[PDB]
Design a protein around this ligand. Structure first.
Ligand SMILES: CCCCCCCCCCCCCCCCCC(=O)OC[C@H](CO[C@@H]1O[C@H](CO[C@H]2O[C@H](CO)[C@H](O)[C@H](O)[C@H]2O)[C@H](O)[C@H](O)[C@H]1O)OC(=O)CCCCCCCCCCCCCCCCC
Ligand SMILES: CCCCCCCCCCCCCCCCCC(=O)OC[C@H](CO[C@@H]1O[C@H](CO[C@H]2O[C@H](CO)[C@H](O)[C@H](O)[C@H]2O)[C@H](O)[C@H](O)[C@H]1O)OC(=O)CCCCCCCCCCCCCCCCC
Ligand code: CLA
Ligand code: CLA
Ligand SMILES: CCCCCCCCCCCCCCCC(=O)OC[C@H](CO[C@@H]1O[C@H](CS(=O)(=O)O)[C@@H](O)[C@H](O)[C@H]1O)OC(=O)CCCCCCCCCCCCCCC
Ligand SMILES: CCCCCCCCCCCCCCCC(=O)OC[C@H](COP(=O)(O)OC[C@@H](O)CO)OC(=O)CCCCCCCCCCCCCCC
Ligand SMILES: CCCCCCCCCCCCCCCC(=O)OC[C@H](COP(=O)(O)OC[C@@H](O)CO)OC(=O)CCCCCCCCCCCCCCC
Ligand SMILES: CCCCCCCCCCCCCCCC(=O)OC[C@H](COP(=O)(O)OC[C@@H](O)CO)OC(=O)CCCCCCCCCCCCCCC
Ligand code: HEM
Ligand SMILES: CCCCCCCCCCCCO[C@@H]1O[C@H](CO)[C@@H](O[C@H]2O[C@H](CO)[C@@H](O)[C@H](O)[C@H]2O)[C@H](O)[C@H]1O
Ligand SMILES: CCCCCCCCCCCCO[C@@H]1O[C@H](CO)[C@@H](O[C@H]2O[C@H](CO)[C@@H](O)[C@H](O)[C@H]2O)[C@H](O)[C@H]1O
Ligand SMILES: CCCCCCCS[C@@H]1O[C@H](CO)[C@@H](O)[C@H](O)[C@H]1O
Ligand SMILES: CCCCCCCS[C@@H]1O[C@H](CO)[C@@H](O)[C@H](O)[C@H]1O
Ligand code: OEX
Ligand SMILES: [Ca+2]
Ligand SMILES: [Ca+2]
Ligand SMILES: [Cl-]
Ligand SMILES: [Cl-]
Ligand SMILES: [Cl-]
Ligand SMILES: [Fe+2]
Lengths: 34, 137, 334, 37, 243, 112, 151, 171, 30, 97, 34
């Protein structure tokens, strides 16, 4: 199909950037003293 | 393979008379060619006019014929254009212009004969390398 | 304390995060200018008539290059060694067509790097150090001078200076090999011995010192925490290292003296690269590599090729093909 | 340099990570068709 | 009376000689004598390029350009026959000289137009009854414009007409049709027109000077693309002498 | 499809063989010899002293088998084209539009 | 000599094959030697006019001694190998030649460079010795230890 | 070397390039480290030749890490602070480099080259005014292959008539 | 977009120079 | 539609003999007595409607006319090809050894 | 220019995935006590 090429990168970043953000916060929360 | 007397036998004149050079003659001819000629004629080409080489077939078709000893010796005394029309001693090293081409000054008949012999023998050794240029290096 | 006094005190201050210094007073602006012009040119400059035959070569990203193909293209062969500042041009467009950015960048850069070396001396002095780090740096600097200034002077044109780009660097090397047989030049060979050898001794030294680290850590932590910055104790066992190395070769090939060793580490690559620099700089005046073309002949007089002759065939390929539209006469005399 | 007294540690618990990942992924599953168009 | 060392580097070498405002006389033409132009000089001062509109039905203008190849643009040391024709007009027949310059000018927005600025094989004639050349005299004529590059020129992939590859070798199994116009080099040969307007005459010396406008095609990159229409304006100098 | 086997001949009717490209070469000259390996024709780089051009030597190509079976071509451009393909061995027709093929060789899974 | 009109011969690039203009207009030789138009020599200057090379002098006034000299110099260019094989790097063995200009230029570049190095060496050492730390850093009075941290 | 340039375009290969970085970087580290230690030495003797003022069994560092660190921090912006890391890194750079070049060569075993940039070629084929150093270097390579192949690969019995040899003007 | 990528990666590298120099972990003597 | 005119000319007599109207002057070195004198005259006075028209060049000596006659068999004439004669290429065509 | 269409995302991920990895490690190191 003649799709928007940028679709791919658009989707990829759309997922990865916020997800990564979360993962960072989560991980640095778990490493904090208990 | 070696440098045989047969290899060292070259036309002396246009009438098909040969001469057999000594190994000493050939070597001196090489030395003298390098000393007085190679600066323009290294390998049998001509740097200041690549259209004319020292291939035997080329000398044969020159006027007068230069594909034998006496032709070449004569050329070294009184060089002409390829068609014989002009004498060019003024821009080409020769006994006649040894005043302005000093490396020609102390050259004997024997020397010119030796050079001529070098020029005739060399393509018999090197073949197409002689006058062939960088393509054949 | 008048104003000049405080200015001098700040310039030569040993407390600035980056040392300025008097050399730095020349370094900083020239390097900033070279860098800025370079980044802009590399991204956006139009094609440049490097060989002065109205055959413009595209070096920048916006004009069809990637990182590997892009370059700041040397100034035009029509210019030769003439000084071509912006104000000698009728317009920025002319300036760009003729490769002005190249000259601005390389002159500012060479000044800047020279002052960088000076500055190494200068801070060594302000800190009470011995002074010769800058002499070690003289080797890569001399190389830069060799490919950007000296070689162009010898050949009569900055159009034969090294291009500011990856592929342009390769072009430079290949044409150089054609015109100088640099591989067969003992100074380049010494340069190779210098950088090969430098890589070797780098690994060697790294590995031996690493090998003899005194145990200061547990298995679940980096051995590097075993060294504390500024600690007075040496952190490895140089006797164990020397023992290993001496046994590996023989007892006397080894250095037990750390100072002598480290001096060797400085000297080998520095001297080698000096010779590389001088190789380029003397080949700048066409004193070229060893020529054994047709050196071996048989009894009749047949040429017996050696590997040198094969090299010659390759060199010939480079020669006849390079700058395919620039020569009208049979000898490439520069 | 003297330490800034306004600093605060930041947190994200596991449930928030899961909720967040679900939001991002589902949003992506929703919008991707439009990104490809 | 300047020497090379007075001149070198000044930019003067690319300028044609000039006549004073005193030179408004006439140069007597004797039909019996034979004449020559000993030195023709043409110094371009403006290169205009005809824009190429989109609707193809709008008036195309000649737009200004920026010279980027520096002071290398003038034609000079041109000599030729100066014929007296039956109707009393004169005809310059160009025989030899430095009668071409490659020139590159740059359009607004950056497009570069290379051209072979030339008067090669110029034949230019006056109006009839030119008993004396005056500041009312003028020449009109035609010249040839050969390909900007000649036949040995190789493109960046090593393709050419009289030499070089005849295909796109980096694309061994590509279809050749779509690349034909780039693969098959072609040698252009066209016509240009020029008008010389005499503005000054020194009849004692036979020196004339004035302005010119010529029109010609630009480089077509050996048939790779369409040429542009160029109009070149400048000043000229000629020295007439009986031969 | 196979285009069929190309047989090259000069104006005298001698069969000529295109020298094949060795794997080392990204690009290769077009050179034609007889059965004994004597150069009879080529595609010249410099033209000024060409002696073996297809035009001079009157090179033609005839196909046997495949789509072009029984056809002969004599116009130098076309003969030259098929010779260029002949340095690759047997000649084939390719669909280059479907994948937007770029005409540059790629390795097989054997390679990868 | 063969009948070429050298002033009008257009080279392949569009620039004149024999003669062209310098960036400021002077008539100069074409080909790569366009870079060398600043050259001046007793054999060439007779062909020079106010605007550079003169086409009429080139057509009519070239003496045989000039031809001789040009050929000599063309064939003794300062190019050659370290083992004194004269000519370009791809030339075959035959001429024993390396120009004195190359020998002198290269020798003195090498010497001038190592003398620059020597100057750095002895200048730095002289400063360090006059100030008293050419033999190293005093452990008991290490200057940097009395300086504030960089950060 | 020359063969690899002409046939493989080896210089364009990112693995060779990483090799060059490893080797020249190693040389750099060798030089810079040596010079640094030698120019931050402690005065441990009275001799102007400072080599004797070292003892293999000595417990103390012979040069000042702190002074070296300040110097390079101010000259270059960053500096080693950890000796162990410094020396490990001196192992790591040239070793890694040589390994990468080995990978590139393994590719070349199969002619799996970094020979071309396809986009470059599509543009240059369509546009005879487009030129870069990359296409220039390919011309050089084509030269190398044509002019060296007959004598370099004699088993192929290559005969390349003069007229097919790629050559620019005059040369 | 290729150009944008090249310039972006480069720009990131320069930013990193900035942080690695001015916001390094300061070396501390023991 | 698109044709390399030089390759094309190689398919005419231009590829077989010295074209008095097109060939570069060095070709005249192939035969006795033609270079440089006659070669210069010939190239200078081109083009020729036929080979024998070369005998009519103003100023030729009787011996020159004889030499030309001896070599008519090696000559040809074809239409002047701009690509071959522009740029002074008949005197220097960028080819040396 | 006619570039490989996957170049972009290939490069993006080539940068992003390992970088993120490092960032995660770094941040959770900093959040650890002491
Ligand atoms: C750790 C590892 C290090 C590895 C890197 C090594 C770096 C050094 C490089 C190795 C050098 C070995 C070269 C020996 C080769 C040789 O046999 O060389 C032979 C040559 C002579 O060659 C001959 O040269 C002749 C020249 O011919 C010409 O001249 C002839 C007559 O002379 C004829 O006229 C002939 O026709 C004409 O062509 C021919 O070519 C012969 O065939 C040819 O054999 O010797 C000469 O050139 C004499 C000049 C030689 C100069 C050598 C200096 C280089 C070293 C620099 C050191 C720097 C440090 C110094 C301070 C400490
Ligand atoms: C191997 C391992 C080496 C290990 C390292 C050792 C450190 C020192 C290295 C020296 C190597 C030994 C070479 C000695 C043999 C030699 O040299 O042999 C060469 C000559 C003697 O041989 C003669 O060499 C001549 C060289 O040609 C010279 O003479 C010719 C004929 O007249 C021509 O005039 C030609 O133009 C001219 O250059 C001819 O070839 C003769 O046939 C031949 O017999 O020695 C000479 O000249 C004297 C040379 C000494 C003084 C000149 C040096 C000047 C160098 C300045 C350049 C600086 C940049 C250099 C970069 C590298
Ligand atoms: C200014 C310095 C200089 C220059 C330019 C020349 C130039 C020349 N000499 Mg002369 N000569 C010199 C000094 C010089 N020489 C010295 C010091 C001596 C005494 C040994 C001689 C004795 C001499 C003789 C006997 C002959 C010559 C000849 C020649 C000619 C051929 C050179 C040759 O083939 O070398 C070959 C090249 C080498 C040997 C390579 C040398 C490379 C050196 C070792 C590199 C050193 C660089 C640097 C100094 C090292 C620093 C070390 C670093 C770690 C600090 C050439 C014109 C020949 C000639 O033709 O005479 C008519 C000849 O026969 N020279
Ligand atoms: C900036 C310049 C430069 C630099 C620094 C390099 C660097 C390198 N090149 Mg490259 N090269 C360059 C330019 C450069 N190149 C150019 C312009 C080209 C043309 C395309 C090449 C063509 C090229 C080729 C064809 C090859 C290289 C290779 C290499 C690598 C070889 C490393 C090595 O030490 O092997 C040295 C060899 C070894 C370390 C093997 C083991 C050696 C044992 C231990 C030695 C035992 C010796 C023993 C004691 C005997 C002594 C006897 C004595 C008498 C002699 C290295 C990364 C090589 C490579 O990539 O390898 C993967 C390679 O094959 N390069
Ligand atoms: C189109 C082009 C346009 C470009 C325009 C660019 C102009 C920039 C002007 C902006 C001026 C402010 C910026 C200063 C930032 C800074 O570095 O401070 C850092 C510190 C802090 O300043 C310190 O600051 C201290 C006090 S305070 O912190 O400032 O309050 C003070 O005690 C101390 O004296 C002082 O040194 O300053 C120093 O360490 C000394 C000056 C260092 C100079 C750096 C020069 C860089 C040269 C680069 C060469 C390479 C080029 C390419 C490299 C990739
Ligand atoms: C141009 C540069 C761009 C920069 C990009 C950076 C992007 C940052 C992305 C932000 C993501 C935020 C995710 C927070 C997710 C999250 O943390 O939830 C849990 C969180 C609970 O917060 P608490 O106050 O309990 O605090 C706990 C702390 O540990 C949180 O930090 O609630 C909120 O954050 C408020 C908004 C919740 C809304 C979430 C609803 C999810 C429902 C699922 C919907 C999908 C399913 C639909 C099916 C039909
Ligand atoms: C003197 C010859 C010049 C070239 C070699 C110079 C050695 C130093 C150059 C490297 C500098 C690295 C950066 C500075 C590194 C640094 O700071 O050095 C420090 C080191 C020790 O310094 P010292 O202060 O203890 O001694 C130097 C003076 O103070 C005198 O006591 O310097 C030396 O050992 C000098 C030795 C010179 C003895 C003569 C050397 C001869 C070598 C011959 C090589 C020939 C090779 C030919 C090819 C095979
Ligand atoms: C006048 C100013 C002149 C300097 C201008 C800017 C110079 C920038 C220097 C590099 C800054 C970034 C360093 C990050 C990394 C960083 O902060 O490292 C910091 C690191 C600190 O070492 P330490 O011994 O303190 O670390 C030991 C332990 O912490 C290890 O766990 O330094 C090194 O490891 C030295 C070797 C790396 C040398 C890398 C040099 C790279 C040069 C540039 C190469 C790429 C250029 C790309 C071109 C587009
Ligand atoms: C050395 C003394 C020397 C010899 C011997 C020599 C020979 C020579 C011959 C036989 C010819 C004729 C070639 C032919 O095919 O007919 C010839 C022609 C030319 N040469 Fe020569 N030559 C010697 C020396 C030199 C030197 C040093 C030069 C360079 C300055 C030189 C050049 C030339 C030129 C030019 C020609 C062609 C001249 C013409 O036909 O107009 N020669 N040489
Ligand atoms: C080719 C041109 C030849 C011209 C003729 C020669 C003229 C030479 C005159 C040199 C003048 C140098 O003058 C120099 O000025 C500076 C700044 O005021 C002085 O510097 C002094 O004052 C400043 C400011 O308080 C202090 O920071 C510094 O520590 C102190 O040395 C130098 O000690 C002095 O020597
Ligand atoms: C490409 C897209 C990527 C998006 C990247 C998003 C960047 C996110 C940056 C998060 C920064 C986290 O900030 C980090 O927080 C922790 C706690 O929260 C701090 O940690 C601090 O608090 C904890 C808890 O009391 C202490 O144990 C710790 O010793 C103290 O330093 C770190 O000092 C700080 O650096
Ligand atoms: C901060 C901006 C620096 C970069 C400016 C680039 C030159 S400016 C640039 O020039 C091109 C060619 O003439 C034009 O096509 C384009 O429209 C114009 O924007
Ligand atoms: C000049 C007309 C010659 C036509 C025949 C050309 C050789 S064959 C030709 O080769 C192409 C690859 O280049 C293939 O894609 C195509 O399928 C095939 O028709
Ligand atoms: O410019 Mn760059 O390169 Ca040193 O040689 Mn000549 O010139 Mn060009 O040719 Mn080869
Ligand atoms: Ca008027
Ligand atoms: Ca396509
Ligand atoms: Cl021949
Ligand atoms: Cl090139
Ligand atoms: Cl040239
Ligand atoms: Fe160390």
């Amino acid at each position: 199909m003649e799709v928007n090429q940028l679709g791919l990168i658009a989707t990829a970043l759309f997922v990865l950037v916020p997800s990564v953000f979360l993962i960072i916060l989560y991980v640095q929360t778990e490493s904090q003293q208990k | 393979a070696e440098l045989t007397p047969e290899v060292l036998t070259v036309p002396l004149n246009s009438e098909g008379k040969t001469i057999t050079l000594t190994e000493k003659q050939y070597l001196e001819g090489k030395r003298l060619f390098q000393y007085a000629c190679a600066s323009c004629h290294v390998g049998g080409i001509t740097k200041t006019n690549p259209s004319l080489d020292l291939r035997t077939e080329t000398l044969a078709l020159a006027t007068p014929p230069r594909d034998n000893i006496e032709g070449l010796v004569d050329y070294m005394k009184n060089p002409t254009t390829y068609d014989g029309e002009q004498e060019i001693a003024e821009v080409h090293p020769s006994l006649r212009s040894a005043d302005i081409f000093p490396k020609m000054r102390n050259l004997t008949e024997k020397d010119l004969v030796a050079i001529a012999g070098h020029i005739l023998v060399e393509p018999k050794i090197l073949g197409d390398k002689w006058g062939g240029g960088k393509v054949y290096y | 304390a008048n104003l000049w006094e405080r200015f001098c005190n700040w310039v030569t201050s040993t407390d600035n995060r980056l040392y300025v210094g008097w050399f730095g007073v020349i370094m900083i602006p020239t390097l900033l200018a070279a860098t800025i012009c370079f980044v802009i040119a590399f991204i956006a400059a139009p094609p440049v008539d490097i060989d002065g035959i109205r055959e413009p070569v595209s070096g920048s990203l916006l004009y069809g290059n990637n990182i590997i193909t892009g370059a700041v293209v040397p100034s035009s062969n029509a210019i030769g060694l003439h000084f071509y500042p912006i104000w000698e041009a009728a317009s920025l467009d002319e300036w760009l067509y003729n490769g002005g950015p190249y000259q601005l960048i390389i002159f500012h850069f060479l000044l800047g790097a020279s002052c960088y070396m000076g500055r190494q001396w200068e801070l060594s002095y302000r800190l009470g150090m011995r002074p010769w780090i800058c002499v070690a740096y003289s080797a890569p600097l001399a190389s830069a001078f060799a490919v950007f200034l000296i070689y162009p002077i010898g050949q009569g044109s900055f159009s034969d200076g090294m291009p500011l780009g990856i592929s342009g660097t390769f072009n430079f090397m290949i044409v150089f090999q054609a015109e100088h047989n640099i591989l067969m030049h003992p100074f380049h060979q010494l340069g190779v011995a210098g950088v090969f050898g430098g890589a070797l001794f780098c690994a060697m030294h790294g590995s031996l010192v690493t090998s003899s680290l005194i145990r200061e850590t547990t298995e679940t932590e980096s051995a590097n925490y075993g060294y504390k910055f500024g600690q007075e104790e040496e952190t490895y066992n140089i006797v164990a290292a020397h023992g290993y190395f001496g046994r590996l070769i023989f007892q006397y090939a080894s250095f037990n003296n750390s100072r002598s060793l480290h001096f060797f580490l400085a000297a080998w690559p520095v001297v080698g690269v000096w010779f590389a620099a001088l190789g380029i700089s003397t080949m700048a005046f066409n004193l070229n590599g060893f020529n054994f073309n047709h050196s071996v002949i048989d009894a009749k007089g047949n040429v017996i090729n050696t590997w040198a002759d094969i090299i010659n065939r390759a060199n010939l390929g480079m020669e006849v093909m390079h700058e395919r539209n620039a020569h009208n006469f049979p000898l490439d005399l520069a | 340099m003297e330490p800034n007294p306004n600093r605060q540690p930041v947190e994200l618990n596991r449930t928030s990570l899961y909720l967040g990942l679900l939001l991002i992924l589902v949003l992506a599953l929703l919008f991707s068709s439009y990104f490809f168009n | 009376t300047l020497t090379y060392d007075d001149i070198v580097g000044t930019g003067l070498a690319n300028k044609c000689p000039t006549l004073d405002d005193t030179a408004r006389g006439a140069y007597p033409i004797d039909s019996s004598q034979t004449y020559r132009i000993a030195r023709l000089c043409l110094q371009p001062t403006t290169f205009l390029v005809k824009e190429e509109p989109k609707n193809k039905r709008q008036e195309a203008e000649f737009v200004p350009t920026k010279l980027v190849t520096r002071e290398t643009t003038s034609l000079d040391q041109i000599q030729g026959e100066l014929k007296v024709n039956s109707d009393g007009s004169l005809t310059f027949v160009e025989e030899d000289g430095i009668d071409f310059q490659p020139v590159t000018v740059q359009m607004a927005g950056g497009e570069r137009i290379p051209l072979l600025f030339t008067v090669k094989n110029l034949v230019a004639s006056t109006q009839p009854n030119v008993t004396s050349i005056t500041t009312s005299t003028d020449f009109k004529g035609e010249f040839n414009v050969p390909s900007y590059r000649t036949a040995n020129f190789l493109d960046p992939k090593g393709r050419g007409l009289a030499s070089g590859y005849d295909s796109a070798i980096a694309l061994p199994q590509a279809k050749e049709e779509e690349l034909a116009r780039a693969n098959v080099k072609r040698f252009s040969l066209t016509k240009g027109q020029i008008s010389l307007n005499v503005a000054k005459v020194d009849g004692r010396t036979g020196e004339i000077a004035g302005t010119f406008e010529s029109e010609q095609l630009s480089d077509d990159d050996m048939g790779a693309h369409e040429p542009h229409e160029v109009k070149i304006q400048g000043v000229f100098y000629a020295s007439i002498e009986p031969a | 499809a196979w285009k069929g086997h190309a047989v090259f001949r000069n104006k005298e009717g001698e069969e000529l063989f295109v020298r094949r490209m060795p794997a080392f070469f990204e690009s290769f000259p077009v050179i034609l010899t007889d059965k004994n390996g004597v150069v009879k024709a080529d595609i010249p780089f410099r033209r000024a002293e060409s002696k073996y051009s297809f035009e001079q030597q009157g090179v033609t190509v005839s196909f046997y088998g495949g789509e072009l079976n029984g056809q002969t071509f004599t116009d130098p451009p076309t003969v030259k084209s098929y010779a260029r393909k002949a340095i690759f061995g047997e000649i084939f027709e390719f669909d280059t539009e479907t994948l937007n093929s770029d005409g540059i060789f790629r390795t097989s899974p054997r390679g990868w | 000599k063969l009948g070429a009109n050298v002033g009008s011969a257009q080279g392949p690039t569009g620039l004149g094959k024999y003669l062209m203009r310098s960036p400021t207009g002077e008539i100069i030789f074409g080909g790569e030697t366009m870079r060398f138009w600043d050259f001046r020599g007793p054999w060439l200057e007779p062909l020079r006019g106010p605007n550079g090379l003169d086409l009429n002098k080139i057509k009519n006034d070239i003496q045989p001694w000039q031809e001789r000299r040009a050929a000599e110099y063309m064939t003794h260019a300062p190019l050659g190998s370290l083992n004194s094989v004269g000519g370009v790097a791809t030339e075959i063995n035959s001429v024993n030649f390396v120009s004195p200009r190359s020998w002198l230029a290269t020798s003195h570049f090498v010497l001038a460079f190592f003398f620059l190095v020597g100057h750095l060496w002895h200048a730095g050492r002289a400063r360090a010795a006059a100030a008293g730390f050419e033999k190293g850093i005093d452990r008991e009075s290490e200057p940097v230890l009395s300086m504030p941290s960089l950060d | 070397l020359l063969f690899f340039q002409g046939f493989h375009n080896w210089t364009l290969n990112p693995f060779h390039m990483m090799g060059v970085a490893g080797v020249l970087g190693g040389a750099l580290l060798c030089a810079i480290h040596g010079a640094t230690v030698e120019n931050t030495l402690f005065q441990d003797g009275e001799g102007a030749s400072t080599f004797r003022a070292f003892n293999p069994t000595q417990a103390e560092e012979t040069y000042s890490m702190v002074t070296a660190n300040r110097f390079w921090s101010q000259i270059f912006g960053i500096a080693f602070s950890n000796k162990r890391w410094l020396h490990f890194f001196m192992l790591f750079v040239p070793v890694t480099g040589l390994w990468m070049s080995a990978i590139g060569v393994v590719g070349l075993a199969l002619n799996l080259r970094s020979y071309d940039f396809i986009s470059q070629e599509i543009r240059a084929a369509e546009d005879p005014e487009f030129e870069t150093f990359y296409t220039k270097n390919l011309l050089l390579n084509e030269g190398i292959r044509a002019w060296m192949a007959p004598q370099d690969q004699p088993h192929e019995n290559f005969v390349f008539p003069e007229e097919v040899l790629p050559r620019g003007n005059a040369l | 977009m290729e150009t944008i990528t090249y310039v972006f990666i480069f720009a990131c590298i320069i930013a990193l120079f900035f942080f690695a120099i001015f916001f390094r972990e300061p070396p501390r003597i023991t | 539609e698109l044709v390399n005119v030089v390759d094309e000319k190689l398919g005419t007599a231009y590829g077989e003999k010295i074209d008095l109207n097109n060939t570069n002057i060095a070709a005249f070195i192939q035969y006795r007595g033609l270079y440089p004198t006659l070669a210069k005259l010939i190239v200078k006075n081109a083009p020729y409607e036929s080979v024998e028209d070369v005998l009519n060049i103003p100023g030729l000596t009787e011996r020159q006319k004889q030499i030309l006659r001896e070599n008519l068999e090696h000559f040809t004439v074809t239409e002047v090809e701009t690509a071959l004669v522009e740029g002074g290429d008949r005197y220097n065509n960028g080819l040396y050894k």
